[PDB]
From Swiss-Prot:
The lineage of its organism: Eukaryota, Fungi, Dikarya, Ascomycota, Pezizomycotina. The gene is EAPA. The chain holds residues 90 to 419 of 419 of the full protein. Keywords: Aspartyl protease, Disulfide bond, Hydrolase, Protease, Signal, Zymogen. GO terms for molecular function: aspartic-type endopeptidase activity. This is Endothiapepsin. It catalyses: Hydrolysis of proteins with specificity similar to that of pepsin A, prefers hydrophobic residues at P1 and P1', but does not cleave 14-Ala-|-Leu-15 in the B chain of insulin or Z-Glu-Tyr. Clots milk. Disulfide bonds join 255-290. The keyword Membrane does not apply. It comes from Cryphonectria parasitica (Chestnut blight fungus).
């Protein structure tokens, strides 16, 4: 089997992407944030505290003839941005782009933190990291990809995120029309539960490539590119007036600037992030200070190849017995 679904930016900055997902019988379609940095499929629901729901579409398990309470199971997750959610668990039929999994754990939120409530466009998350990170207790549950894998034509999914435009998540096949050149594959460590790999270096604009190992994670659920402070300083030093602002929370730059590109290495191959992809717009409405799309990872503990980086590539998440990542230009 295969599946193919369009993913759409939630706003004009590409702060996140939403993909429609069918849950239950008859189908209830929710727009989920596909997150290769986590491993829980959780949704706003009829069980979510009413004051914490503000415009989201909810899953109502009592209206699904295929929903079953997973008795005794609870979940609770906290994300790198400080947001969180928790609740109980049903199993139900879940379909993405024509690919159907029966018996998928659907984690129903009883509580969500303010940032989820405040984002009316995201109805939940669909985790695509390794199932070892799934938070369901006392019986850990599998991701949608893990459940689908054996049925897929090939044990892979691909992320093709658009810049200020829709893109595609495919399951079970590699669309050879969706990229240019060849796909360069690189090793993955699953030891932390992430799609963790090592970039071979970087360049800023037309500058020379610096060969240096940068361990980090391919994370579709993180907006920006978070890299070591040395790398980030070298980038922003090429932008007149750019500076790190403790009050804003990262590098800012004059909105009048034209940003240089940023290149990252995948083996001997190179992925070029155009400068425009690094502009996240005014820090507050009407400001002439703009927020940068490349930020330091120094306070995180891990480097994160988030959407800023991934949207410059066609990315293969290869879930073969030994997982790997592939990157192609597009």
């Amino acid at each position: 089997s295969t599946g193919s679904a369009t993913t759409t930016p939630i706003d004009s900055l590409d702060d996140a992407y939403i993909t429609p997902v069918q849950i239950g019988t008859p189908a209830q379609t929710l727009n989920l944030d596909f997150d290769t940095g986590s491993s829980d499929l959780w949704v706003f629901s009829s069980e979510t505290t009413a004051s914490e729901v503000d415009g989201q579409t909810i899953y109502t398990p009592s209206k699904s003839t295929t929903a079953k309470l997973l008795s005794g199971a609870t979940w609770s997750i906290s994300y790198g941005d400080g947001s969180s959610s928790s609740g109980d668990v049903y199993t139900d039929t879940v379909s993405v782009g024509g690919l159907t999994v029966t018996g998928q754990a659907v984690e129903s939120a009883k509580k969500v933190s303010s940032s989820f409530t405040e984002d009316s466009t995201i109805d939940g998350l669909l985790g695509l990291a390794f199932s070892t990170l799934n938070t369901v207790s006392p019986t850990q549950q599998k991701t949608f990809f893990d459940n689908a894998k054996a049925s897929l034509d090939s044990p892979v999914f691909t992320a093709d995120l658009g810049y200020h435009a829709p893109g595609t998540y495919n399951f079970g096949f590699i669309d050879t029309t969706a990229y240019t050149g060849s796909i360069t594959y690189t090793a993955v460590s699953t030891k932390q539960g992430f799609w963790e790999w090592t970039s071979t270096g970087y360049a800023v604009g037309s500058g020379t490539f610096k060969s240096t190992s940068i361990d980090g994670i391919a994370d579709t659920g993180t907006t920006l590119l978070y890299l070591p402070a040395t790398v980030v300083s070298a980038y922003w030093a090429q932008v007149s007036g750019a500076k790190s602002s403790s009050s804003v929370g990262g590098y800012v730059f004059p909105c009048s600037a034209t940003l240089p590109s940023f290149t990252f290495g995948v083996g001997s191959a190179r992925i070029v992030i155009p400068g425009d992809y690094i502009d996240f717009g005014p820090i507050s409405t009407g400001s002439s200070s703009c927020f940068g799309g490349i930020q330091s990872s120094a306070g995180i503990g891990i480097n994160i190849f988030g959407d800023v980086a991934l949207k410059a590539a066609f990315v293969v998440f290869n879930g073969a017995t030994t997982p790997t990542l592939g990157f192609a230009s597009k």
